[PDB]
Amino acid sequence: KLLRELNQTSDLNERKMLLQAKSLWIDVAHNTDACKNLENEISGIQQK
Amino acid sequence: LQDLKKEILDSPRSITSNTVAKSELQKSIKFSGSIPEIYLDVVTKETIS
C-alpha cells in the first residue's frame, strides 16, 4: 500500500523529472541556438 | 527505481499439499449429499497404501 502511495507520488516525481529534463533540454536548445548565432556572427566576420 | 518498481508491481506481491487432488476428487464425486472435507482429506492423504 505504501508502494502504491509511492506510485501515486512517483507519477508527480516522474512529471517533475520530465519538467527538469525539459528545462535541461531547453537550456541545451538555448546553448545550441546561441552557438548557431555565434556561428552566424563568425561566418559574417569570416565573410568580412 | 520508479520504472523498476512498476515492473516489480507487475510481479505478485504479498500449504496446498493436496489441494488440487482433493478439489478434483470433490468436483467428480457423483454424490448428492454433505461429502465432509475430512473424508476428502483422509482419502487424498494415504501416501502408503
mmCIF file with all atom_site columns, all heavy atoms in Angstrom, chain B residues 4 6-14 16 18 21-22 24 28 30-32 34 36-37 40 45:
data_model
loop_
_atom_site.group_PDB
_atom_site.id
_atom_site.type_symbol
_atom_site.label_atom_id
_atom_site.label_alt_id
_atom_site.label_comp_id
_atom_site.label_asym_id
_atom_site.label_entity_id
_atom_site.label_seq_id
_atom_site.pdbx_PDB_ins_code
_atom_site.Cartn_x
_atom_site.Cartn_y
_atom_site.Cartn_z
_atom_site.occupancy
_atom_site.B_iso_or_equiv
_atom_site.pdbx_formal_charge
_atom_site.auth_seq_id
_atom_site.auth_comp_id
_atom_site.auth_asym_id
_atom_site.auth_atom_id
_atom_site.pdbx_PDB_model_num
ATOM 1   N N   . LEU B 1 4  ? 11.613  0.432   -12.325 1.00 0.00 ? 4  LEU B N   1
ATOM 2   C CA  . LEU B 1 4  ? 11.896  -0.926  -11.791 1.00 0.00 ? 4  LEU B CA  1
ATOM 3   C C   . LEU B 1 4  ? 10.743  -1.341  -10.873 1.00 0.00 ? 4  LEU B C   1
ATOM 4   O O   . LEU B 1 4  ? 10.313  -2.504  -10.961 1.00 0.00 ? 4  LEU B O   1
ATOM 5   C CB  . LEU B 1 4  ? 13.231  -0.890  -11.042 1.00 0.00 ? 4  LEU B CB  1
ATOM 6   C CG  . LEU B 1 4  ? 13.690  -2.221  -10.452 1.00 0.00 ? 4  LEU B CG  1
ATOM 7   C CD1 . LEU B 1 4  ? 15.147  -2.490  -10.791 1.00 0.00 ? 4  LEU B CD1 1
ATOM 8   C CD2 . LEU B 1 4  ? 13.483  -2.240  -8.946  1.00 0.00 ? 4  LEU B CD2 1
ATOM 9   N N   . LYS B 1 6  ? 7.681   -0.312  -11.077 1.00 0.00 ? 6  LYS B N   1
ATOM 10  C CA  . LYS B 1 6  ? 6.482   -0.543  -11.923 1.00 0.00 ? 6  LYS B CA  1
ATOM 11  C C   . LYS B 1 6  ? 6.517   -1.990  -12.422 1.00 0.00 ? 6  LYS B C   1
ATOM 12  O O   . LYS B 1 6  ? 5.462   -2.653  -12.364 1.00 0.00 ? 6  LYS B O   1
ATOM 13  C CB  . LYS B 1 6  ? 6.420   0.463   -13.076 1.00 0.00 ? 6  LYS B CB  1
ATOM 14  C CG  . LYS B 1 6  ? 5.165   0.383   -13.935 1.00 0.00 ? 6  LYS B CG  1
ATOM 15  C CD  . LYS B 1 6  ? 3.881   0.423   -13.131 1.00 0.00 ? 6  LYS B CD  1
ATOM 16  C CE  . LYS B 1 6  ? 2.645   0.177   -13.970 1.00 0.00 ? 6  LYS B CE  1
ATOM 17  N NZ  . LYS B 1 6  ? 2.650   -1.178  -14.571 1.00 0.00 ? 6  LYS B NZ  1
ATOM 18  N N   . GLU B 1 7  ? 7.682   -2.466  -12.873 1.00 0.00 ? 7  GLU B N   1
ATOM 19  C CA  . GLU B 1 7  ? 7.810   -3.888  -13.295 1.00 0.00 ? 7  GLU B CA  1
ATOM 20  C C   . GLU B 1 7  ? 7.664   -4.789  -12.062 1.00 0.00 ? 7  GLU B C   1
ATOM 21  O O   . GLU B 1 7  ? 7.101   -5.893  -12.200 1.00 0.00 ? 7  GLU B O   1
ATOM 22  C CB  . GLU B 1 7  ? 9.147   -4.127  -13.998 1.00 0.00 ? 7  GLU B CB  1
ATOM 23  C CG  . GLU B 1 7  ? 9.527   -3.052  -15.001 1.00 0.00 ? 7  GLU B CG  1
ATOM 24  C CD  . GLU B 1 7  ? 8.423   -2.587  -15.934 1.00 0.00 ? 7  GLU B CD  1
ATOM 25  O OE1 . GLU B 1 7  ? 7.975   -3.396  -16.770 1.00 0.00 ? 7  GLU B OE1 1
ATOM 26  O OE2 . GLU B 1 7  ? 8.016   -1.412  -15.826 1.00 0.00 ? 7  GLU B OE2 1
ATOM 27  N N   . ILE B 1 8  ? 8.166   -4.338  -10.908 1.00 0.00 ? 8  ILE B N   1
ATOM 28  C CA  . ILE B 1 8  ? 8.049   -5.120  -9.639  1.00 0.00 ? 8  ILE B CA  1
ATOM 29  C C   . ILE B 1 8  ? 6.566   -5.217  -9.250  1.00 0.00 ? 8  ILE B C   1
ATOM 30  O O   . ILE B 1 8  ? 6.148   -6.296  -8.799  1.00 0.00 ? 8  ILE B O   1
ATOM 31  C CB  . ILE B 1 8  ? 8.916   -4.483  -8.532  1.00 0.00 ? 8  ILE B CB  1
ATOM 32  C CG1 . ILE B 1 8  ? 10.380  -4.919  -8.633  1.00 0.00 ? 8  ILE B CG1 1
ATOM 33  C CG2 . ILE B 1 8  ? 8.352   -4.766  -7.150  1.00 0.00 ? 8  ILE B CG2 1
ATOM 34  C CD1 . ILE B 1 8  ? 11.169  -4.702  -7.362  1.00 0.00 ? 8  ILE B CD1 1
ATOM 35  N N   . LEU B 1 9  ? 5.798   -4.136  -9.428  1.00 0.00 ? 9  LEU B N   1
ATOM 36  C CA  . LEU B 1 9  ? 4.342   -4.151  -9.118  1.00 0.00 ? 9  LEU B CA  1
ATOM 37  C C   . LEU B 1 9  ? 3.666   -5.184  -10.020 1.00 0.00 ? 9  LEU B C   1
ATOM 38  O O   . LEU B 1 9  ? 2.722   -5.844  -9.546  1.00 0.00 ? 9  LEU B O   1
ATOM 39  C CB  . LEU B 1 9  ? 3.757   -2.754  -9.343  1.00 0.00 ? 9  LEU B CB  1
ATOM 40  C CG  . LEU B 1 9  ? 3.122   -2.096  -8.118  1.00 0.00 ? 9  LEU B CG  1
ATOM 41  C CD1 . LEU B 1 9  ? 2.010   -1.142  -8.530  1.00 0.00 ? 9  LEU B CD1 1
ATOM 42  C CD2 . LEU B 1 9  ? 2.595   -3.138  -7.142  1.00 0.00 ? 9  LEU B CD2 1
ATOM 43  N N   . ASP B 1 10 ? 4.134   -5.313  -11.267 1.00 0.00 ? 10 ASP B N   1
ATOM 44  C CA  . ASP B 1 10 ? 3.586   -6.348  -12.184 1.00 0.00 ? 10 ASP B CA  1
ATOM 45  C C   . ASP B 1 10 ? 3.787   -7.728  -11.544 1.00 0.00 ? 10 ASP B C   1
ATOM 46  O O   . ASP B 1 10 ? 2.879   -8.571  -11.686 1.00 0.00 ? 10 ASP B O   1
ATOM 47  C CB  . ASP B 1 10 ? 4.211   -6.250  -13.578 1.00 0.00 ? 10 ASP B CB  1
ATOM 48  C CG  . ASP B 1 10 ? 4.078   -4.875  -14.209 1.00 0.00 ? 10 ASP B CG  1
ATOM 49  O OD1 . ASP B 1 10 ? 3.116   -4.161  -13.863 1.00 0.00 ? 10 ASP B OD1 1
ATOM 50  O OD2 . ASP B 1 10 ? 4.938   -4.528  -15.040 1.00 0.00 ? 10 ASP B OD2 1
ATOM 51  N N   . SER B 1 11 ? 4.921   -7.946  -10.866 1.00 0.00 ? 11 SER B N   1
ATOM 52  C CA  . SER B 1 11 ? 5.164   -9.233  -10.153 1.00 0.00 ? 11 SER B CA  1
ATOM 53  C C   . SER B 1 11 ? 4.256   -9.337  -8.918  1.00 0.00 ? 11 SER B C   1
ATOM 54  O O   . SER B 1 11 ? 4.076   -8.314  -8.227  1.00 0.00 ? 11 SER B O   1
ATOM 55  C CB  . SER B 1 11 ? 6.626   -9.388  -9.795  1.00 0.00 ? 11 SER B CB  1
ATOM 56  O OG  . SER B 1 11 ? 6.871   -9.027  -8.443  1.00 0.00 ? 11 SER B OG  1
ATOM 57  N N   . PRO B 1 12 ? 3.675   -10.518 -8.607  1.00 0.00 ? 12 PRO B N   1
ATOM 58  C CA  . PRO B 1 12 ? 2.747   -10.656 -7.478  1.00 0.00 ? 12 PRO B CA  1
ATOM 59  C C   . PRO B 1 12 ? 3.427   -10.299 -6.153  1.00 0.00 ? 12 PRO B C   1
ATOM 60  O O   . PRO B 1 12 ? 4.544   -10.731 -5.922  1.00 0.00 ? 12 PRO B O   1
ATOM 61  C CB  . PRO B 1 12 ? 2.356   -12.140 -7.471  1.00 0.00 ? 12 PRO B CB  1
ATOM 62  C CG  . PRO B 1 12 ? 3.431   -12.820 -8.294  1.00 0.00 ? 12 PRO B CG  1
ATOM 63  C CD  . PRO B 1 12 ? 3.872   -11.786 -9.310  1.00 0.00 ? 12 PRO B CD  1
ATOM 64  N N   . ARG B 1 13 ? 2.735   -9.526  -5.317  1.00 0.00 ? 13 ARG B N   1
ATOM 65  C CA  . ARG B 1 13 ? 3.348   -9.081  -4.040  1.00 0.00 ? 13 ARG B CA  1
ATOM 66  C C   . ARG B 1 13 ? 2.424   -9.418  -2.866  1.00 0.00 ? 13 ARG B C   1
ATOM 67  O O   . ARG B 1 13 ? 1.210   -9.191  -3.001  1.00 0.00 ? 13 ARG B O   1
ATOM 68  C CB  . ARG B 1 13 ? 3.645   -7.580  -4.102  1.00 0.00 ? 13 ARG B CB  1
ATOM 69  C CG  . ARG B 1 13 ? 4.380   -7.060  -2.879  1.00 0.00 ? 13 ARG B CG  1
ATOM 70  C CD  . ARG B 1 13 ? 5.757   -7.679  -2.759  1.00 0.00 ? 13 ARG B CD  1
ATOM 71  N NE  . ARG B 1 13 ? 6.493   -6.957  -1.737  1.00 0.00 ? 13 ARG B NE  1
ATOM 72  C CZ  . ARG B 1 13 ? 6.669   -7.394  -0.501  1.00 0.00 ? 13 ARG B CZ  1
ATOM 73  N NH1 . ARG B 1 13 ? 6.185   -8.572  -0.144  1.00 0.00 ? 13 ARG B NH1 1
ATOM 74  N NH2 . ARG B 1 13 ? 7.334   -6.656  0.366   1.00 0.00 ? 13 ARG B NH2 1
ATOM 75  N N   . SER B 1 14 ? 2.981   -9.958  -1.777  1.00 0.00 ? 14 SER B N   1
ATOM 76  C CA  . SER B 1 14 ? 2.182   -10.234 -0.551  1.00 0.00 ? 14 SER B CA  1
ATOM 77  C C   . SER B 1 14 ? 0.916   -11.023 -0.905  1.00 0.00 ? 14 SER B C   1
ATOM 78  O O   . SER B 1 14 ? 0.185   -11.384 0.036   1.00 0.00 ? 14 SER B O   1
ATOM 79  C CB  . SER B 1 14 ? 1.861   -8.942  0.156   1.00 0.00 ? 14 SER B CB  1
ATOM 80  O OG  . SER B 1 14 ? 1.234   -9.185  1.403   1.00 0.00 ? 14 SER B OG  1
ATOM 81  N N   . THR B 1 16 ? -1.196  -25.993 0.420   1.00 0.00 ? 16 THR B N   1
ATOM 82  C CA  . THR B 1 16 ? -1.655  -26.591 -0.869  1.00 0.00 ? 16 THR B CA  1
ATOM 83  C C   . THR B 1 16 ? -0.942  -27.928 -1.115  1.00 0.00 ? 16 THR B C   1
ATOM 84  O O   . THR B 1 16 ? -0.563  -28.196 -2.273  1.00 0.00 ? 16 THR B O   1
ATOM 85  C CB  . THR B 1 16 ? -1.509  -25.596 -2.032  1.00 0.00 ? 16 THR B CB  1
ATOM 86  O OG1 . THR B 1 16 ? -0.129  -25.433 -2.370  1.00 0.00 ? 16 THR B OG1 1
ATOM 87  C CG2 . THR B 1 16 ? -2.114  -24.243 -1.723  1.00 0.00 ? 16 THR B CG2 1
ATOM 88  N N   . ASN B 1 18 ? -2.235  -31.000 -0.895  1.00 0.00 ? 18 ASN B N   1
ATOM 89  C CA  . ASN B 1 18 ? -3.117  -31.890 -1.696  1.00 0.00 ? 18 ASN B CA  1
ATOM 90  C C   . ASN B 1 18 ? -4.354  -31.119 -2.170  1.00 0.00 ? 18 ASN B C   1
ATOM 91  O O   . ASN B 1 18 ? -5.380  -31.769 -2.432  1.00 0.00 ? 18 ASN B O   1
ATOM 92  C CB  . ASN B 1 18 ? -3.510  -33.133 -0.894  1.00 0.00 ? 18 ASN B CB  1
ATOM 93  C CG  . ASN B 1 18 ? -4.337  -32.800 0.329   1.00 0.00 ? 18 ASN B CG  1
ATOM 94  O OD1 . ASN B 1 18 ? -4.126  -31.778 0.978   1.00 0.00 ? 18 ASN B OD1 1
ATOM 95  N ND2 . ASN B 1 18 ? -5.295  -33.651 0.641   1.00 0.00 ? 18 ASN B ND2 1
ATOM 96  N N   . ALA B 1 21 ? -5.585  -32.250 -5.771  1.00 0.00 ? 21 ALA B N   1
ATOM 97  C CA  . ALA B 1 21 ? -6.133  -33.627 -5.810  1.00 0.00 ? 21 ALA B CA  1
ATOM 98  C C   . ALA B 1 21 ? -7.485  -33.664 -5.094  1.00 0.00 ? 21 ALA B C   1
ATOM 99  O O   . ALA B 1 21 ? -8.430  -34.280 -5.633  1.00 0.00 ? 21 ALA B O   1
ATOM 100 C CB  . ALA B 1 21 ? -5.151  -34.586 -5.184  1.00 0.00 ? 21 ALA B CB  1
ATOM 101 N N   . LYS B 1 22 ? -7.567  -33.020 -3.928  1.00 0.00 ? 22 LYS B N   1
ATOM 102 C CA  . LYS B 1 22 ? -8.831  -33.010 -3.150  1.00 0.00 ? 22 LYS B CA  1
ATOM 103 C C   . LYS B 1 22 ? -9.908  -32.276 -3.953  1.00 0.00 ? 22 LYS B C   1
ATOM 104 O O   . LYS B 1 22 ? -11.056 -32.755 -3.980  1.00 0.00 ? 22 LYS B O   1
ATOM 105 C CB  . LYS B 1 22 ? -8.603  -32.353 -1.789  1.00 0.00 ? 22 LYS B CB  1
ATOM 106 C CG  . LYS B 1 22 ? -9.856  -32.163 -0.952  1.00 0.00 ? 22 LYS B CG  1
ATOM 107 C CD  . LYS B 1 22 ? -9.563  -31.555 0.391   1.00 0.00 ? 22 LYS B CD  1
ATOM 108 C CE  . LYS B 1 22 ? -8.853  -30.224 0.285   1.00 0.00 ? 22 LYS B CE  1
ATOM 109 N NZ  . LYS B 1 22 ? -8.552  -29.657 1.621   1.00 0.00 ? 22 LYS B NZ  1
ATOM 110 N N   . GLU B 1 24 ? -10.144 -31.911 -7.239  1.00 0.00 ? 24 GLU B N   1
ATOM 111 C CA  . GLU B 1 24 ? -10.557 -32.723 -8.417  1.00 0.00 ? 24 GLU B CA  1
ATOM 112 C C   . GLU B 1 24 ? -11.436 -33.891 -7.959  1.00 0.00 ? 24 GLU B C   1
ATOM 113 O O   . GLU B 1 24 ? -12.399 -34.226 -8.681  1.00 0.00 ? 24 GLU B O   1
ATOM 114 C CB  . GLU B 1 24 ? -9.323  -33.170 -9.204  1.00 0.00 ? 24 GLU B CB  1
ATOM 115 C CG  . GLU B 1 24 ? -8.633  -32.008 -9.897  1.00 0.00 ? 24 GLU B CG  1
ATOM 116 C CD  . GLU B 1 24 ? -9.571  -30.949 -10.456 1.00 0.00 ? 24 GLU B CD  1
ATOM 117 O OE1 . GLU B 1 24 ? -10.455 -31.308 -11.261 1.00 0.00 ? 24 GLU B OE1 1
ATOM 118 O OE2 . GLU B 1 24 ? -9.414  -29.766 -10.092 1.00 0.00 ? 24 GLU B OE2 1
ATOM 119 N N   . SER B 1 28 ? -15.519 -34.320 -9.263  1.00 0.00 ? 28 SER B N   1
ATOM 120 C CA  . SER B 1 28 ? -16.082 -35.591 -9.793  1.00 0.00 ? 28 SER B CA  1
ATOM 121 C C   . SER B 1 28 ? -16.485 -36.492 -8.621  1.00 0.00 ? 28 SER B C   1
ATOM 122 O O   . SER B 1 28 ? -15.713 -37.410 -8.288  1.00 0.00 ? 28 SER B O   1
ATOM 123 C CB  . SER B 1 28 ? -15.109 -36.272 -10.729 1.00 0.00 ? 28 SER B CB  1
ATOM 124 O OG  . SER B 1 28 ? -13.866 -36.531 -10.092 1.00 0.00 ? 28 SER B OG  1
ATOM 125 N N   . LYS B 1 30 ? -20.105 -37.497 -8.001  1.00 0.00 ? 30 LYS B N   1
ATOM 126 C CA  . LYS B 1 30 ? -21.310 -38.302 -8.358  1.00 0.00 ? 30 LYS B CA  1
ATOM 127 C C   . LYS B 1 30 ? -22.178 -38.559 -7.117  1.00 0.00 ? 30 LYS B C   1
ATOM 128 O O   . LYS B 1 30 ? -22.872 -39.593 -7.089  1.00 0.00 ? 30 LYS B O   1
ATOM 129 C CB  . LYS B 1 30 ? -20.897 -39.621 -9.023  1.00 0.00 ? 30 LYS B CB  1
ATOM 130 C CG  . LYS B 1 30 ? -20.976 -39.633 -10.542 1.00 0.00 ? 30 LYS B CG  1
ATOM 131 C CD  . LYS B 1 30 ? -22.386 -39.463 -11.060 1.00 0.00 ? 30 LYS B CD  1
ATOM 132 C CE  . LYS B 1 30 ? -22.466 -39.523 -12.571 1.00 0.00 ? 30 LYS B CE  1
ATOM 133 N NZ  . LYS B 1 30 ? -23.858 -39.367 -13.053 1.00 0.00 ? 30 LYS B NZ  1
ATOM 134 N N   . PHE B 1 31 ? -22.155 -37.654 -6.136  1.00 0.00 ? 31 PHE B N   1
ATOM 135 C CA  . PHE B 1 31 ? -22.915 -37.893 -4.883  1.00 0.00 ? 31 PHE B CA  1
ATOM 136 C C   . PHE B 1 31 ? -23.694 -36.636 -4.509  1.00 0.00 ? 31 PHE B C   1
ATOM 137 O O   . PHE B 1 31 ? -23.086 -35.548 -4.501  1.00 0.00 ? 31 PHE B O   1
ATOM 138 C CB  . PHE B 1 31 ? -21.973 -38.298 -3.748  1.00 0.00 ? 31 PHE B CB  1
ATOM 139 C CG  . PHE B 1 31 ? -22.666 -38.737 -2.483  1.00 0.00 ? 31 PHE B CG  1
ATOM 140 C CD1 . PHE B 1 31 ? -23.274 -39.979 -2.397  1.00 0.00 ? 31 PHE B CD1 1
ATOM 141 C CD2 . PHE B 1 31 ? -22.712 -37.907 -1.375  1.00 0.00 ? 31 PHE B CD2 1
ATOM 142 C CE1 . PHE B 1 31 ? -23.908 -40.381 -1.232  1.00 0.00 ? 31 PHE B CE1 1
ATOM 143 C CE2 . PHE B 1 31 ? -23.345 -38.310 -0.210  1.00 0.00 ? 31 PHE B CE2 1
ATOM 144 C CZ  . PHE B 1 31 ? -23.945 -39.545 -0.140  1.00 0.00 ? 31 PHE B CZ  1
ATOM 145 N N   . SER B 1 32 ? -24.987 -36.784 -4.219  1.00 0.00 ? 32 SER B N   1
ATOM 146 C CA  . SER B 1 32 ? -25.776 -35.626 -3.731  1.00 0.00 ? 32 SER B CA  1
ATOM 147 C C   . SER B 1 32 ? -25.892 -35.748 -2.213  1.00 0.00 ? 32 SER B C   1
ATOM 148 O O   . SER B 1 32 ? -26.809 -36.455 -1.744  1.00 0.00 ? 32 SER B O   1
ATOM 149 C CB  . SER B 1 32 ? -27.123 -35.559 -4.393  1.00 0.00 ? 32 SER B CB  1
ATOM 150 O OG  . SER B 1 32 ? -27.795 -36.806 -4.310  1.00 0.00 ? 32 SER B OG  1
ATOM 151 N N   . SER B 1 34 ? -23.686 -34.415 1.885   1.00 0.00 ? 34 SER B N   1
ATOM 152 C CA  . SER B 1 34 ? -22.751 -33.499 2.594   1.00 0.00 ? 34 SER B CA  1
ATOM 153 C C   . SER B 1 34 ? -21.319 -33.597 2.046   1.00 0.00 ? 34 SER B C   1
ATOM 154 O O   . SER B 1 34 ? -20.730 -32.528 1.807   1.00 0.00 ? 34 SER B O   1
ATOM 155 C CB  . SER B 1 34 ? -22.766 -33.791 4.066   1.00 0.00 ? 34 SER B CB  1
ATOM 156 O OG  . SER B 1 34 ? -22.388 -35.138 4.301   1.00 0.00 ? 34 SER B OG  1
ATOM 157 N N   . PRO B 1 36 ? -18.284 -34.548 3.621   1.00 0.00 ? 36 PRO B N   1
ATOM 158 C CA  . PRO B 1 36 ? -17.465 -33.761 4.542   1.00 0.00 ? 36 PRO B CA  1
ATOM 159 C C   . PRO B 1 36 ? -16.005 -33.697 4.080   1.00 0.00 ? 36 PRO B C   1
ATOM 160 O O   . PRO B 1 36 ? -15.519 -34.656 3.495   1.00 0.00 ? 36 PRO B O   1
ATOM 161 C CB  . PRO B 1 36 ? -17.543 -34.511 5.878   1.00 0.00 ? 36 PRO B CB  1
ATOM 162 C CG  . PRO B 1 36 ? -18.777 -35.369 5.754   1.00 0.00 ? 36 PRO B CG  1
ATOM 163 C CD  . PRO B 1 36 ? -18.864 -35.717 4.282   1.00 0.00 ? 36 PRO B CD  1
ATOM 164 N N   . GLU B 1 37 ? -15.343 -32.577 4.367   1.00 0.00 ? 37 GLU B N   1
ATOM 165 C CA  . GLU B 1 37 ? -13.942 -32.373 3.914   1.00 0.00 ? 37 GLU B CA  1
ATOM 166 C C   . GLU B 1 37 ? -13.012 -33.403 4.562   1.00 0.00 ? 37 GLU B C   1
ATOM 167 O O   . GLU B 1 37 ? -11.964 -33.691 3.972   1.00 0.00 ? 37 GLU B O   1
ATOM 168 C CB  . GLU B 1 37 ? -13.506 -30.942 4.234   1.00 0.00 ? 37 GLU B CB  1
ATOM 169 C CG  . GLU B 1 37 ? -14.247 -29.898 3.416   1.00 0.00 ? 37 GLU B CG  1
ATOM 170 C CD  . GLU B 1 37 ? -13.985 -29.944 1.919   1.00 0.00 ? 37 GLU B CD  1
ATOM 171 O OE1 . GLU B 1 37 ? -12.899 -30.415 1.523   1.00 0.00 ? 37 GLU B OE1 1
ATOM 172 O OE2 . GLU B 1 37 ? -14.865 -29.502 1.150   1.00 0.00 ? 37 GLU B OE2 1
ATOM 173 N N   . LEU B 1 40 ? -12.538 -36.316 2.292   1.00 0.00 ? 40 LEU B N   1
ATOM 174 C CA  . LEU B 1 40 ? -11.634 -35.993 1.159   1.00 0.00 ? 40 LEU B CA  1
ATOM 175 C C   . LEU B 1 40 ? -10.192 -35.966 1.673   1.00 0.00 ? 40 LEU B C   1
ATOM 176 O O   . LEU B 1 40 ? -9.313  -36.486 0.975   1.00 0.00 ? 40 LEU B O   1
ATOM 177 C CB  . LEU B 1 40 ? -12.043 -34.647 0.554   1.00 0.00 ? 40 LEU B CB  1
ATOM 178 C CG  . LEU B 1 40 ? -13.464 -34.579 -0.003  1.00 0.00 ? 40 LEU B CG  1
ATOM 179 C CD1 . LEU B 1 40 ? -13.741 -33.213 -0.609  1.00 0.00 ? 40 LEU B CD1 1
ATOM 180 C CD2 . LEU B 1 40 ? -13.701 -35.668 -1.037  1.00 0.00 ? 40 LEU B CD2 1
ATOM 181 N N   . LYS B 1 45 ? -4.823  -38.302 1.333   1.00 0.00 ? 45 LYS B N   1
ATOM 182 C CA  . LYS B 1 45 ? -3.538  -38.213 2.077   1.00 0.00 ? 45 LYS B CA  1
ATOM 183 C C   . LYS B 1 45 ? -3.058  -39.594 2.559   1.00 0.00 ? 45 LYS B C   1
ATOM 184 O O   . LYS B 1 45 ? -2.472  -39.641 3.639   1.00 0.00 ? 45 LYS B O   1
ATOM 185 C CB  . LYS B 1 45 ? -3.692  -37.276 3.279   1.00 0.00 ? 45 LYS B CB  1
ATOM 186 C CG  . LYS B 1 45 ? -3.814  -35.800 2.937   1.00 0.00 ? 45 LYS B CG  1
ATOM 187 C CD  . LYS B 1 45 ? -3.954  -34.935 4.164   1.00 0.00 ? 45 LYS B CD  1
ATOM 188 C CE  . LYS B 1 45 ? -4.059  -33.464 3.833   1.00 0.00 ? 45 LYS B CE  1
ATOM 189 N NZ  . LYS B 1 45 ? -4.158  -32.630 5.052   1.00 0.00 ? 45 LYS B NZ  1
#
